[PDB]
Structure 1
């Protein structure tokens, strides 16, 4: 997957497993959510293209969101969209499958850097807008969470299991966006 460097950034994040413990406590994530996020993995695995299609459509129908993938001339950069899509697809699986350990934290730092002006547009060597305003990363917790639900409700698992999968996904999405604030936030205020 071009540009996907999970587990091989060779850069230790500015947050560690104690930070992660305290953040999991604040978002109410426990060993129960680890179980159910993993169960979500098998449910979502074969639906990733339809999830991606849904999320492409939401972004594509909103000029002020599609903006973040545009070339200077205001048109979508199709190379950029396609390359990011492959890494986004993998992130769906990673969120369910990966242990949230230091390597995971090190990639969460990398993902935040790539939304921020620090590293945006470098992974794919594209010319596009410099920064994704942080307000929209927070806002996206809702669509990224909520639009997962109908996919979770498909694979013939019990509705009770679906709800536990869904709550685990809400917590995990929130946890990640909290970490991705790091490069955006004034030093010492995170």
Structure 2
């Protein structure tokens, strides 16, 4: 999966493992979500594609958001989308799967720098808009959560377990955006 370089980013993350523990805490994330994030894997596992299709009907629907995949000529760069949709999809599983260790942190850095201007458009060697305004990375916490939910309601679990999955998911999407802001914030204020 091209550009997907979890493990080998190898520039080193400006946040550490105490930083994470304390952010887990800000976000109410325990070991009790640890289990229940994993269980959302074996659930959302086989539906990834149908998920992407509901995702991309949100993005594709909104010109000022589709904006962010566009070539200078103001059309969607179709190469830029097929590529991301591969890595984004590996996100979903990674999230449910990787233990949140040093490696993990270094990609949470990576993935944030890719949204930023620092590394945007460089993974897929494409020419598009130079920065995604952080304001939207915060906003997508809502639609990355809400819309995952109907899909947790599926693989035949007890609605309580669905809640616990939902919530974990909400907690980890937030955690992630939270970290992503690193390259965005004025040095010293993160």
Residue-by-residue CA offset, 1:50-94 (whole Å, 9 max, x unaligned)? 110001110001000000000000000000000000000000001
Partners in 2 of 1:50 and 1:130 — Cα distance?
29
Aligned length: 190
How far does residue 96 in structure 1 lie from its aligned partner after superposition? Answer: 0.4
How far does residue 11 in structure 1 lie from its aligned partner after superposition? Answer: 1.6
Residue-by-residue CA offset, 1:108-158 (whole Å, 9 max, x unaligned)? 000000000000000000000000000000000000011000000000011
Partners in 2 of 1:186 and 1:127 — Cα distance?
26
Structure 1 runs (4+) deviating above 2 angstroms are: none
Partners in 1 of 2:50 and 2:134 — Cα distance?
27
TM-score (norm 2): 0.99
Secondary structure of residue in 1 paired with 2:92: helix
How far does residue 12 in structure 1 lie from its aligned partner after superposition? Answer: 1.5
Partners in 2 of 1:146 and 1:2 — Cα distance?
29
Secondary structure of residue in 1 paired with 2:182: coil
Partners in 1 of 2:102 and 2:11 — Cα distance?
10
TM-score (norm 1): 0.99
Unaligned runs of 5+ residues in structure 2 are none
Partners in 2 of 1:103 and 1:68 — Cα distance?
28
Aligned Cα RMSD in Å? 0.4
Secondary structure of residue in 1 paired with 2:87: helix
Quote the residue 2:36 is aligned against. 36
Quote the residue 1:21 is aligned against. 21
Partners in 1 of 2:172 and 2:98 — Cα distance?
12
Secondary structure of residue in 2 paired with 1:68: helix
